[PDB]
Enzyme design. Sequence first.
Site, PDB file in Angstrom:
ATOM      1  N   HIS A  95       0.806  -1.180   0.044  1.00 14.11           N
ATOM      2  CA  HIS A  95      -0.065   0.022   0.015  1.00 14.11           C
ATOM      3  C   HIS A  95       0.870   1.142  -0.139  1.00 14.11           C
ATOM      4  O   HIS A  95       1.980   1.170   0.157  1.00 14.11           O
ATOM      5  CB  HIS A  95      -0.694  -0.010   1.117  1.00 14.11           C
ATOM      6  N   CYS A 109      -0.099   2.740  -4.489  1.00 15.04           N
ATOM      7  CA  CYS A 109      -0.575   3.977  -4.945  1.00 15.04           C
ATOM      8  C   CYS A 109       0.141   5.023  -4.450  1.00 15.04           C
ATOM      9  O   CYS A 109       1.271   4.860  -3.493  1.00 15.04           O
ATOM     10  CB  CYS A 109      -1.985   4.094  -3.805  1.00 15.04           C
TER      11      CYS A 109
END
EC number: 3.4.22.36
Lengths: 167, 167, 87, 87
Positions: free
Chosen positions: A107, A155
């Site tokens: 992440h 991301c």
Amino acid sequence: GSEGNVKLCSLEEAQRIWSAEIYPIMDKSSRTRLALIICNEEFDSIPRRTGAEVDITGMTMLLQNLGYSVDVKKNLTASDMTTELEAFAHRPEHKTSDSTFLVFMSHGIREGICGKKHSEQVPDILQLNAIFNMLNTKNCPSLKDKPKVIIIQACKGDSPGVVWFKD
Amino acid sequence: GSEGNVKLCSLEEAQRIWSAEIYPIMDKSSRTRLALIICNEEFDSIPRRTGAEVDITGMTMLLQNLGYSVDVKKNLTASDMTTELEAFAHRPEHKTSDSTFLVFMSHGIREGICGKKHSEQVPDILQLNAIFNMLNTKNCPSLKDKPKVIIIQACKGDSPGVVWFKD
Amino acid sequence: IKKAHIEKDFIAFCSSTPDNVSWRHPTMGSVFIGRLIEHMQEYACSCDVEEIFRKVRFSFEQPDGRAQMPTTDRVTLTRCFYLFPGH
Amino acid sequence: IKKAHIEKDFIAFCSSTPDNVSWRHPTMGSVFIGRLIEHMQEYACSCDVEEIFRKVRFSFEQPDGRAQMPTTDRVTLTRCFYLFPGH
């Protein structure tokens, strides 16, 4: 995951490519190419990154088939990532290598890559700056003049990354 | 400064280059290519950037010779730079252009490009993020799918950028 | 309504790496700028901008004297940008 | 003592642009990773990494469905990096 079978560069294709603007490759039988994959799948406060094993499999097979000895580290805090990168940078194999690959899969947010403990309340973030710093000429002299490829699956924030238009 | 005379791409060299992976160029006689140069030479609290006129001359002649109408803006604060970039992004000529160049030349620090009023005490900084934001698809729809080349002459900090070694 | 990528078809070329100085001769001008112009003059005919920019970086490879290393950043060019000078 | 560039011969390739999401299929894996592997498998033989990475960016050009745009950053490669697979 992926088999990672790479179309080979033929003897004559390597000739067509070979002048003074190409990174030199070391002898196949003596070189010790290294690659590192850091992949976070399980987090304290972020949903499991299901499918990460597919990414690990594919990248591992590919990097091996390109001639790299691949080390895989999983579910690390930014602190563990830092320690691991420092250890990787000091590996003596780089001295008899011609290149390296560093693969990060986690992440991520604008600030950087999420460690396993990351929360909005208590950030656990590896900054991209730190990756470069740890692999720079000072901290990794063995990879001076050698290509250092950094691959990041994450991301960079939560925006869909699009704008809408009528016409 | 520099004459900016560019070796021409011959009809047969353009043929050798031409397949589906090249940016399309618009018709020579109808296209309206635009380029912007922002150059700060005179500052409130930073020494004069002597030689900046050489940079302006050379870049202007080069960009003109590559087919761009070149606008030059000098000695701007980050605020004036922002306004100028917003105006540039909205220029209708981009609609009948195939590309753009943006050239920044100033003092610089880690945070970004120095405006004319910059001091350690009161920063006057244009962030690189803002440049991209102002020229993105939302804020500059006319340059969607067209190459946007950003050239920056500036320090990114005050380090010599070297490490020393004995052997 | 239709979607479009917010950020695409950019390339940035900076005179030095993060933290680090870029040099400017008080009469001869900025070294990066002069080097960029010279490479564009010579290679715009046969090389795309990514190729040209790499060539510029190469010219700074030896850290002699006032060293610096130009860097290409935030590259989302999906195609080759050839300038086709003369066309 | 001799000087060396602090930062040189790097290339970073990220799955999406600043602020923006990258996508991962829960069974098929991360789209950027899968796309990167496929392009490396196919083009490592004939293209340098900068070229390969551009090809990957191209594959994401159409912002259909779960759009994202991979980006190449902090490029200080002074030479072409060919992997010469098989060698």
